[PDB]
Design a protein around this ligand. Structure first.
Ligand code: HEM
Ligand SMILES: O=C(O)c1cccnc1
Length: 153
């Protein structure tokens, strides 16, 4: 698909749609995560000692937001330039992931949780062309973070 002008127009549009609702889209995102893999709960400080996912914990929102931003930013950068650029941020990310005990078999957990989250986010507008555009952008970004964890470990 590549990322035509037409495809990127499609990712931007659908990211703007996600930020419009951060406490929802982020809490859904942690439930789609514990649905896919329950044990992950122990990993997150603010999830431990809890029994359910807190819905209004600022630490949790700030946390999940920052994840989706990072996937959008990557798509535009592929359309315009043709690649995903690796900066300071991307590498610190790879350290923290390893402290916290996180592995690669974890990544399809968080991808399916984010395609399912954006399918949920764009509803009927959804196209094959669009799913193909976010799929392309997540896979291209995770290829990069995995790459730095393996370096932070
Ligand atoms: C493209 C994919 C991914 C992106 C963009 C991403 C991004 C981030 C960021 C931005 C932080 C620190 C947030 C803070 O300072 O506020 C972080 C922390 C962390 N990450 Fe991810 N991540 C990805 C995949 C994963 C996966 C697959 C897992 C495993 C389930 C995971 C588990 C964690 C844990 C346990 C922490 C520490 C949270 C704490 O207790 O403070 N991440 N990540
Ligand atoms: O909240 C976090 O810190 C988080 C969530 C998903 C993936 N990575 C980090």
């Amino acid at each position: 698909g590549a990322l035509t002008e037409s495809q990127a127009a499609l990712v931007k549009s659908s990211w703007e749609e996600f930020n419009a609702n951060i406490p929802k889209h982020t809490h859904r995102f942690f439930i789609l995560v514990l649905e896919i893999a329950p044990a992950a709960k122990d990993l997150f400080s603010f999830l431990k000692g809890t029994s359910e996912v807190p819905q209004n914990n600022p630490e949790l929102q700030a946390h999940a937001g920052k994840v989706f931003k990072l996937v959008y930013e990557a798509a535009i950068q592929l359309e315009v330039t043709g690649v995903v650029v690796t900066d300071a941020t991307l590498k610190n990310l790879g350290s923290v992931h390893v402290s916290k005990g996180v592995a690669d078999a974890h990544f399809p957990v968080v991808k399916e949780a984010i395609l399912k989250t954006i399918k949920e986010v764009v509803g009927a507008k959804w196209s094959e062309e669009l799913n193909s555009a976010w799929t392309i952008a997540y896979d291209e970004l995770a290829i990069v973070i995995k790459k730095e964890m393996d370096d932070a470990a």
